Design a protein around this ligand. Structure first.
Ligand code: NAG
Ligand code: NAG
Ligand code: NAG
Ligand code: NAG
Ligand code: NAG
Ligand code: NAG
Ligand code: NAG
Ligand code: NAG
Ligand code: CA
Ligand code: CA
Ligand code: CA
Ligand code: CA
Ligand code: CA
Ligand code: CA
Ligand code: CA
Ligand code: CA
Ligand code: CA
Ligand code: CA
Ligand code: CA
Ligand code: CA
Ligand code: CA
Ligand code: CA
Ligand code: CA
Ligand code: CA
Lengths: 486, 276, 25, 275, 276, 275
């Protein structure tokens, strides 16, 4: 639905530095500031058989402020803060041209260039001294070496031109910058006096690649001149993509989902392989984390730990206690590594199978999806604790059972004896809950080994029963998949 | 795929269909709005198409999945209205004296018509029965009919003198003329400017819906007088501003598509019956 | 598969220096 | 506190309890809103007294049935006030006032819950189908400009009111619906008209509206798919206002049977203001 | 949810009661001061509303959750006071000769009246008992009451001559008039300026609390003479400086709030009884 | 929803029988498409009536036979609307019209599904061997420019229309096939001639193309390797149009026995416009 299109071109980038000067008073001997300034430039050049018109803008950063001041006397020479560029300073050259490629520069999958370095040398500036020997600025040079292309925009008068920004590094060069007829010799670097040396333009040549993502709702019919710019793009409605994600569960499978859920999914494993733009593949993971932190579930984790810490120094009746410890068990499940099938495994599996078959179209929207699913998926779940072959099972809705392992018949529950063990003994997610398990034992009479395995939520036995095509387990896991509805 | 044959479909009644969920029609189809030009004039704009496309996108429809096909007025739209599109909404602005013209246009676009040609100067014609009409479309149709008895002696008309013929429409750009079914007829209409076709009414066309913008219910699409059904696709809404009309449609568009449905003839299933 | 939620929570500290990037920039 | 959560049980063979018709007639208060041209054509002024004396036979105590004249339909549409226990609103149909009558019917036949809207300060956004913006005043000109996520208008500049899109001008009452999900900027004449953000709860069954003239036009539901004919969309054909009033007096029992007293609010306002 | 039925609700006398909702009411509700313009005049400021909102924030009320309202004076505020606001405080400066009008305003707001229109020209109006008054509001109310015998004959007055009527109030911006129960009355009231409503007194108004800034307890909100109760929402405070008054209110806003409570008729629980 | 998935079981023994019935019209309709040259040579104008009378004896009721006159092959190729059920198209062969006749045959004899092509705004491709582009109008000068992976025109500059390659110039109808899998930029005179992306479904078996003149040249299949002879690609030998029409009338039973009425569409258009 979103098609890659390569637009790699060989370009010639022409640019010139901008010089701003501010005079200090008196009779005209001193100066206040000599500094680099943003500089525009227009040109045209022949390439590939057509004349392409280009617009460039040069700017400087990291600039040093040398100084020189002959004293407080009202005629002694000096420049209060005269700049230079050296190792630290960078120069950006925003580049634009009328060619077709720059119309399709909104969404990009990749972008990188190869430009040839250049040597910029300083000119000759005759500081305007009213009388006497003429001071002479001369010399100084650097070399621009390309390092990295990014997106950018010229805030040009008539419109805002989306453009490519080339960040060139620097390298000080041989000619020792001097203030001749004056006390500054054998410096090195390019000062702001006359960075252009009278040249009409400093010139670079190279080749830049680009992989745009022009949209497509049909194979044969691909567009030109991408014009769905962020003026023409707007927030997809929250309920709208909620409905889309809910609809996506039309297609999810039964056993393949469990097979995926039995992976270790990490940051790289999930968030890689998303057909996204460059601006979102840069920080998708951090974007997801930022909104994951403030989710109701995450602040519930924080409240649990802080409440326990504060308690460390502070010193249907059953349904309420069971429900509260059920929420607590959900929190514990999320924070710790359980050895069972662990409902959040299934939640993450559904999440991956949903997001993989989507696309990023100028807005991340994995925030509000990953973090929202983390809290909404599988709203009512169940846990259990086995002890002495009398497993006590609990539901987040408040229900409770206590049934034997060898034969699945329940027993009167023991509140405050389940609570002593739920703190320390390992909790087992009940993906095969007591009701479905009783159905399975009644209809398909099972053995001690597989009974214990299903109680423990062993992936081996779960997949064995799924691949037996057991209707009970098949239907149960299908409903498990179906509550994942955001 | 076993086209061109009616073979009965068996289907269970107590099946879960848990996997079943909503059909996001807007992700694939193409919505398609027709309006009178006076809507554009009152709007007094010209990026309003872009604005409405943006709001449709916000409702769900991709960028190119919406079209805005203007028409000059109701009557000039009624001449051979071909709605080659996927979800047609037609904003018919009611004004008095356009009653039957609105109704006949609505019938034409809401019923699938299977039309054969006619050679008025050569053959006498008769409607087979209830579902048959003659559709006359052109710049200015003027249909005159001379009924013929069994002996080809016209009743109330002389088969030569066109003057004695019985007019059934004049200066009408569209006319769905019905005559007594089972009677031979000679026809006379201005053959250069108007074409006429012997048409049968198939089932309903669900690709198209009519938002009537003005006054009370009038759309008696069924040419029978006894039955005046209110088909759900014949929506109606009051108005005092075309922006309010368009905003209403955009806001409630999903329900409109739920009212409508895909063109049943355009599917693969109808390949060898009358696929269109 | 649940490992990713734990990874998000554990590694969430870096969002602080990411928003530091955003505000300093 | 109420037992909303707990359920009510009830058998099916319970004998029908006797009629409370006498109770409702003796306690409640019928209340007729009607245009001024009704009185003008009646050409009288003992006529309200006569109508009360004629309700007395139908079974209303004398000091119950009230009459609350209004200037015309469009003027009554502004801040309509349901003063009264059982409400009837005579409404003379005429061409070009179809939307105005529909607006009034939508406003009074339904229970609207209205929050304040400050046009100048904030951009406002519609929650869903059951939300509208109701503007009331001597003259309302709701000019809207929808915005991108960047607070940039589409089809309109956020700073030039002349690029905005009008949705209703010079209307006394306007129930404007906009695309649900958008941040709009509104321009409306704040001194003479006031706009409110009104959700629409269930139906107000205290009011009946009697279209005195022409055809069925009242699309109470802004959704264009549905056009329900509520039981309280009363209609009559008229030439003489005395005949209309006699019809109402004669068949008043059935009108009250259609209505239901229980949906009466404390205020006389047609909506619940919920600052 | 079974609105409209007063079905019994059972509760155990041993269930452990739950934590505070002070934070809930602060975050969700909105507090709402009413004060006289003389107060702002003495304050002699004009960032003071913002400053008080900032001070309220530390007590807990979000920035947009407090609404300050001014009024010219008590009698002017009495005519049609609409307290459409979720936790209402009414500052009330007491000066002599306004005791009855002040008590009238308090009786109007602190209680919850359901009430019907009156048509003074047509009918003769009774009062049904202790709970029934007539409330007259307007720029100039003057209620002249003539009681009648069972034969529709005035006693102490004449149905014709309005001057012989017994004036129960005059030039009152608000007047609550009670009269002998079960006697027909003919009223004369200035129909162009003042409007009168026949009003029954339901339960008390949860929502509003009145703070008398001046003197001693004088607010009799019970027309009965035998009982002068002391309501929690009816409070007093001595003063010499409006900044001091506002600071006391802000400091003690917790206590004022948890003396008041949410309007019972604005709840969903009272949906089909007299929801407001 | 005609259940096009469940299998149908026949039998290999029983029985050769009749076709029961079908009720949507009284009966089928035969439909001649002849050039104006036939009328000019015949030098008549009661001849349509004479031919109808001579069809009646062959066993076609009077109203079933329709006649359609067209200027010539190229002027008819534009939007050939087959308004009818059993179509015959008598095409006079003429040297240098070989590819035009092949274009028209490929258009009508086969069932097409056409989408619009907005040339100004998009590039275009060809999905597979079954996908052509069809350009029709008064004058179609279709200049293409193929583009490599880098969106640089190969053999052409996208910004210089002159460098393009003219696949077909000044045709009333042009079926153009460019290489499948390479994007193209198109250029044609949008005022006069439109163009559509047309995929080829199965055959349309209402239509019989009768080559009146020379050799067997109709290559319906654009593939050079294949050149099938279809039962509907009729060919007859002529000196006089009266002889041609008489042969058609005499052998019309075979002419309709080779075709099939089932593959018909509501609209008379020669393709399904799928937008
Ligand atoms: C949906 O599920 C039913 C039974 O659960 C199955 O028979 C059917 O094939 C499934 N279809 C789809 C499209 O998932
Ligand atoms: C219609 O009537 C006119 C007037 O006599 C005549 O010239 C014309 O031929 C008639 N139409 C046909 C199709 O015969
Ligand atoms: C109800 O009416 C019936 C007959 O009309 C009578 O027998 C019965 O006593 C009445 N009950 C009440 C409660 O009025
Ligand atoms: C409405 O627009 C006018 C100018 O058209 C402007 O003066 C006024 O301030 C606008 N209303 C508001 C509330 O800003
Ligand atoms: C209620 O408050 C107490 C202390 O005031 C605290 O210990 C307890 O956790 C609170 N209840 C809940 C449910 O947080
Ligand atoms: C009260 O009496 C005055 C005459 O003194 C009269 O003008 C007025 O109409 C009377 N009030 C009513 C309600 O009729
Ligand atoms: C089938 O058609 C033939 C036509 O010659 C007819 O004679 C025969 O009767 C038909 N079949 C039956 C069973 O009648
Ligand atoms: C087609 O080419 C002509 C001249 O070669 C040019 O004027 C026209 O703009 C082109 N069409 C399009 C759609 O660019
Ligand atoms: Ca005649
Ligand atoms: Ca007509
Ligand atoms: Ca008929
Ligand atoms: Ca009818
Ligand atoms: Ca505009
Ligand atoms: Ca209005
Ligand atoms: Ca809405
Ligand atoms: Ca409606
Ligand atoms: Ca007296
Ligand atoms: Ca008073
Ligand atoms: Ca009393
Ligand atoms: Ca008292
Ligand atoms: Ca050709
Ligand atoms: Ca070339
Ligand atoms: Ca091809
Ligand atoms: Ca071939």
């Amino acid at each position: 639905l979103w098609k890659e299109m390569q637009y790699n071109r060989d370009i010639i980038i022409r640019f010139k530095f901008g010089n701003s000067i501010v005079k200090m008073g008196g009779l005209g001997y001193k100066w206040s500031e000599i500094s680099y300034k943003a500089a525009n430039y227009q040109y045209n050049y022949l390439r590939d058989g057509e004349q392409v018109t280009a617009h460039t803008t040069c700017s400087v950063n990291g600039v040093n402020n040398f100084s020189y001041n002959g004293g407080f006397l009202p005629t002694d020479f000096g420049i209060s803060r005269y700049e230079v560029i050296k190792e630290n300073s960078y120069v950006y050259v925003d580049y634009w041209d009328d060619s077709k490629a720059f119309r399709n520069i909104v969404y990009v999958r990749s972008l990188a260039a190869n430009l040839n370095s250049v040597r910029c040398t300083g000119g000759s500036y005759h500081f305007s001294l009213p009388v006497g020997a003429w001071p002479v600025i001369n010399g100084g040079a650097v070399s621009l070496h390309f390092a990295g292309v990014t997106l950018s925009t010229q805030f040009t008068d008539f419109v805002s031109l989306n453009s490519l920004r080339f960040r060139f590094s620097l390298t000080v060069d041989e000619p020792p910058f001097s203030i001749l007829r004056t006390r500054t010799v054998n410096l090195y670097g390019l000062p702001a006096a006359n960075p252009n040396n009278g040249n009409e333009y400093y010139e670079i040549s190279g080749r830049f690649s680009l992989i745009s993502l022009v949209p497509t709702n049909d194979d044969y019919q691909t567009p030109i001149m991408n014009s769905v710019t962020v003026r023409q793009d707007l927030e997809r409605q929250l309920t709208n993509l909620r409905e889309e994600f809910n609809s996506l569960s039309q297609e999810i499978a039964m056993a393949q989902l469990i097979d995926l859920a039995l992976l270790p999914l990490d940051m790289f494993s999930m968030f890689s392989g998303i057909k996204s733009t460059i601006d979102l593949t840069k920080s998708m993971a951090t974007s997801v984390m930022k909104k994951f932190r403030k989710s109701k579930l995450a602040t519930s984790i924080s409240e649990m730990t802080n409440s326990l810490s504060d308690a460390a120094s502070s010193a249907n009746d059953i349904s309420t206690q069971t429900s509260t410890i059920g929420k607590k068990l959900r929190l514990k499940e999320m924070i710790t590594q359980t050895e069972g099938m662990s409902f959040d495994d299934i939640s993450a599996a559904v999440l991956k199978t949903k997001i993989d078959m989507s696309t990023q179209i100028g807005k991340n929207t994995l925030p509000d999806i990953v973090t929202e699913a983390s809290e909404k998926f599988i709203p009512k779940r169940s846990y259990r604790i086995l002890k002495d072959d009398e497993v006590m099972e609990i539901n987040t809705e408040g229900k409770f059972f206590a049934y034997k392992i060898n034969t699945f018949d329940e027993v009167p529950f023991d509140v405050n004896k389940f609570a002593e063990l739920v703190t320390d003994s390992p909790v087992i997610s009940a993906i095969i809950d007591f009701k479905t398990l009783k159905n399975l034992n009644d209809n398909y009479g099972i053995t001690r080994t597989e009974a214990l395995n299903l109680i423990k939520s062993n992936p081996n036995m779960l997949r064995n029963f799924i691949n037996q095509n057991n209707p009970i387990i098949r239907n149960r896991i299908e409903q498990l998949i179906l509550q994942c509805k955001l | 795929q076993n086209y061109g044959l009616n073979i009965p479909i068996t289907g269970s009644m107590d099946t879960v269909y848990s996997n079943s969920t909503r059909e996001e029609v807007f992700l694939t189809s193409t919505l398609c709005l027709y309006y009178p030009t006076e809507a554009s004039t009152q709007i007094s704009d010209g990026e309003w198409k872009d604005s409405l496309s943006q709001m449709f996108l916000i409702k769900g429809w991709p960028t190119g999945s919406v079209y805005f096909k203007e028409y000059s007025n109701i009557v000039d739209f009624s001449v051979d209205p071909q709605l080659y599109c996927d979800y047609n909404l037609v904003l018919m602005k009611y004004d008095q004296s356009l009653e039957l013209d609105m109704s006949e246009l609505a019938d034409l676009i809401l019923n699938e018509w299977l039309c054969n040609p006619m050679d008025i100067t050569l053959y006498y014609y008769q409607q087979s029965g209830e579902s048959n009409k003659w559709i006359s479309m052109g710049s200015s149709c003027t249909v005159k009919v001379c009924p013929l008895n069994t002996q080809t002696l016209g009743i109330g008309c002389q088969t030569t003198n066109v003057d004695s013929f019985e007019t059934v429409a004049e200066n009408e750009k569209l006319a769905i003329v019905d005559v007594v079914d089972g009677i031979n007829h000679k026809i006379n209409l201005t053959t250069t400017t108007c074409t006429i076709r012997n048409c049968k009414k198939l089932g309903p066309r669900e690709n198209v819906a009519v938002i009537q913008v003005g006054g009370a219910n009038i759309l008696d699409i069924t040419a029978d007088p006894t039955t005046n059904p209110q088909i759900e696709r014949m929506m109606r809404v009051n108005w005092k501003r075309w922006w309010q009309v368009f905003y209403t449609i955009v806001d409630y568009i999903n329900q409109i598509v739920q009212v409508m449905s895909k063109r049943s003839r355009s599917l693969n299933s109808a390949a060898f019956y009358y696929r269109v | 598969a649940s490992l990713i939620y734990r990874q998000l929570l554990t590694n969430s500290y870096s969002v602080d220096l990411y928003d530091e990037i955003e505000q300093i920039g």
